Amino acid sequence: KSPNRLVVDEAINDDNSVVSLHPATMEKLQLFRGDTILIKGKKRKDTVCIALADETCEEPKIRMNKVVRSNLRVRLGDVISVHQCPDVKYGKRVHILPVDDTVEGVT
């Protein structure tokens, strides 16, 4: 039992960076709205996402889209840990590539 352990659920917004948390839980954890946080799930995967306020959600739950859940290897009903990380730094360079199966054809 910890204040940062929350049960994942379906989200409203489909963006891959927005994560909505109940304002009560954010105030409990002292989290600034629109700031960066880190989420850890199963195995050893973790992600960095920007949090936002959503009174619709419940305190013991957090809402994420399928992209973030896939990155975390967590299905619905699992529990994830959230940690404040406002010290995130802007990146000078990012090397990104597509996937073969999804990009088949179009070039």
Add this chain to the structure above:
Amino acid sequence: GNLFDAYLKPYFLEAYRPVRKGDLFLVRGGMRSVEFKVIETDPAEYCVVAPDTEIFCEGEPVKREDEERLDDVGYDDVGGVRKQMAQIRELVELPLRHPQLFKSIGVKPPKGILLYGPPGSGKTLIARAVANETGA
């Protein structure tokens, strides 16, 4: 018999028609269609037939040599269906002729087509025409 005056002379007498070596042209008459292959032309492979031009058709029949039957069913052998045939063409010709583009786009076109109508209205004819026109 005298195929020349029967078929070719009416076909060339009026209009000055272009001709190219190796090409087959279709002449309709006598309840049948006859395909004539241009064995040779002068002064070059491309020529224009004129009234004074000589026509030689005393040779033996020539083999088809992998040529397609010009009497095969096509869109010109189907009548009374222009809207339906247009729909069928728009559904079929685009993917079959250009499957690479469709598989690259990612959109899934329909595959199930059902031609329903009274007997004698086509259906079998339309499918053969589409197949022959698309080569599928």
